[PDB]
Amino acid sequence: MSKIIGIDLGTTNSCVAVLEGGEVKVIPNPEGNRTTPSVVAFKNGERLVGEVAKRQAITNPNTIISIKRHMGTDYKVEIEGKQYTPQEISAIILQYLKSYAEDYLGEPVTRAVITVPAYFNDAQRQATKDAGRIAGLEVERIINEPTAAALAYGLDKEEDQTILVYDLGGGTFDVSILELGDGVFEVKATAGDNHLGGDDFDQVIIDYLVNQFKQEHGIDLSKDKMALQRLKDAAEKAKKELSGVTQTQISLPFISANENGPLHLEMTLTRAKFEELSAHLVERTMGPVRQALQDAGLTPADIDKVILVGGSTRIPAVQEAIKRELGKEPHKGVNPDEVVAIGAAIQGGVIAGEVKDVVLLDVTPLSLGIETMGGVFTKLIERNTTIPTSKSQVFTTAADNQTTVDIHVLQGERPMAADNKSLGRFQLTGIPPAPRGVPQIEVTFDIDANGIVHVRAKDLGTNKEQSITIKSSSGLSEEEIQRMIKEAEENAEADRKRKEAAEL
Ligand SMILES: Nc1ncnc2c1ncn2[C@@H]1O[C@H](COP(=O)(O)OP(=O)(O)O)[C@@H](O)[C@H]1O
Ligand SMILES: [Mg+2]
């Protein structure tokens, strides 16, 4: 039966993870990348999704970007006179992800756990549950992104605590305060900016570039789709490189043309210059963090953990800003581009891991024991004990100078030996003379997996032993077993038999 893939169906990107072995694995798509653009293009009647669709987003007029902003709305996109709902376009993305998860698994995947923003309403959720179904997936669970991220860090396996997840994606900014209470998360606060994301950090670069070009050649590249698409792609690639390097080259040869021929755009962009251009974007990120603290009635001190989610969280200036705002070192331990999908796959594994199957197990049908001074039944192995089993009890002599002890093995539930079934008898002889209660005879009952019991009596000081395989015709089976099992609680109370404190 199918696995439950974890799906992060994001505004800019989507990611799918699955639990295989005992580890969560992020599934690479057809071209080897772990995240695929959440965009669909209808070029020539063929539905394109992923990078191939994003590569022509500026160039192609019917290309659908961030359709997630629509979900749960009666919005309609029209391509060549045909209307599609957000559920339908979300389904296409959905179908892609499911497909490549099947390639990777080498088997059909028909179940999933889909992730959504903590603030999605019923309409919004339902729209993504419906998208899953259109795509052919049984949506086992709709969990929210902040929680999925917490799951990826295994926070639900820890002590009660307050968590702040700072989520900066390609198009939106979300901050959620989660309070873990006895392994269960609760969203205390939510705040954000649904128009603050990596795309905007992109937009600063693109603007700086076309302006230098506007003042150096009097040409506005933002008016040429082909030039713009080249700019968009290059502005994003440069932003990313600036996350691990302080200097980078934006090289756009044959970008345009004038009276004298081809024009080339070449220029080195430093981290410092990029940070300068986007400093306002980084500050717009602080308000939602404070409003969320206010709503929860908290202060940076009440937050035990800050978690980072979103690819834009990789930006050095962004990490330094929340580090300074909260006074805590952010957790980036798990890939911020995959953290949500990873938490969804853990939940999927948990759902898929539920077993309700029963296993047969042999247990002792009645209490087993030995007769003890005064006609009382002394049990060694209680009723309903799992076999194989082995129990040992040390017994002693009743009178001064015993030589011998009679081991009478019984099976039943009542206190006096006379009311139980006799299973066998043997005796240990040659016990060195000693005062009463001084010699130590260890009797051990050993039951093998087939229910046969073997009794041994061993003089611990001498090491001489005797034993027998108490043994079937072994006596009781069907009725007799239940007849005695009732009758013992029934006639209860010659448990008066504590009259047997025939004392000493
Ligand atoms: N190394 C990086 N440095 C800065 N930004 C990055 C890096 N890698 C990806 N990003 C940005 O992360 C954003 C995508 O965020 P992500 O969490 O993948 O998306 P979504 O909003 O769909 O959930 C994009 O704007 C991308 O350019
Ligand atoms: Mg996201």
29 pocket-lining for ligand 1 (C-beta < 6 Å):
no
- E strand or H helix at 388, and its extent? none
* Alpha-carbon span 120 to 400, nearest angstrom: 84
What backbone phi and psi angles, to 5 degrees, belong to 147?
-65, -40
Cα distances (angstroms) measured from residue 445 to each of 190, 358, 416: 64, 29, 20
Return the CA Rg of the chain: 38
Catalytic residue from among 88, 130, 140, 145: 145
Deposited experimental method: X-ray
Q: Is 174 a catalytic residue?
A: no
| Nearby residues of 177 by Cβ (< 8 Å), 6 or more positions away | 162, 163, 164, 187, 188, 189, 190, 292, 293, 296, 298, 303
The token pair that represents 294 in the structure block: 């206010």
Nearby residues for ligand 2 (ion, Cβ within 5 Å)? 10, 169
248 pocket-lining for ligand 1 (C-beta < 6 Å):
no
Which residue do the tokens 């911020």 mark? Answer: 336
415 pocket-lining for ligand 1 (C-beta < 6 Å):
no
What backbone phi and psi angles, to 5 degrees, belong to 205?
-60, -50
Half-sphere exposure of 171 (CA within 13 A, CB side): 15
Q: From the CA of 310, give the closest atom in ligand 1.
A: 17
How are beta strands 4-9 and 111-116 bridged, if at all?
Answer: parallel
Specified resolution (Å): 2.4
Closest C-alpha among 129, 136, 11 to residue 64: 11
Q: Burial of 13 by CB count in 10 Å (0-12 exposed, 13-18 middle, 19+ buried)?
A: buried
Q: Is 145 a catalytic residue?
A: yes
Q: Which residues pair with 405 in a beta bridge?
A: 428
How are beta strands 82-84 and 4-9 bridged, if at all?
Answer: unpaired
The token pair that represents 62 in the structure block: 């019917």
Domains of the chain from N-terminus onward:
1-157+337-359 (3.30.420.40), 158-196+279-336 (3.30.420.40), 197-278 (3.90.640.10), 360-504 (2.60.34.10)
Q: Which residues pair with 305 in a beta bridge?
A: 163
Residue located nearest, by CA, to atom 5 of ligand 1: 312
Q: Which residues pair with 113 in a beta bridge?
A: 6, 141
CB 279 within 8 A of CB 272: no
Q: From the CA of 309, give the closest atom in ligand 1.
A: 17
* DSSP character string of 48-82: EESHHHHTTTTT-SSEEE-GGGTTTS---EEETTE
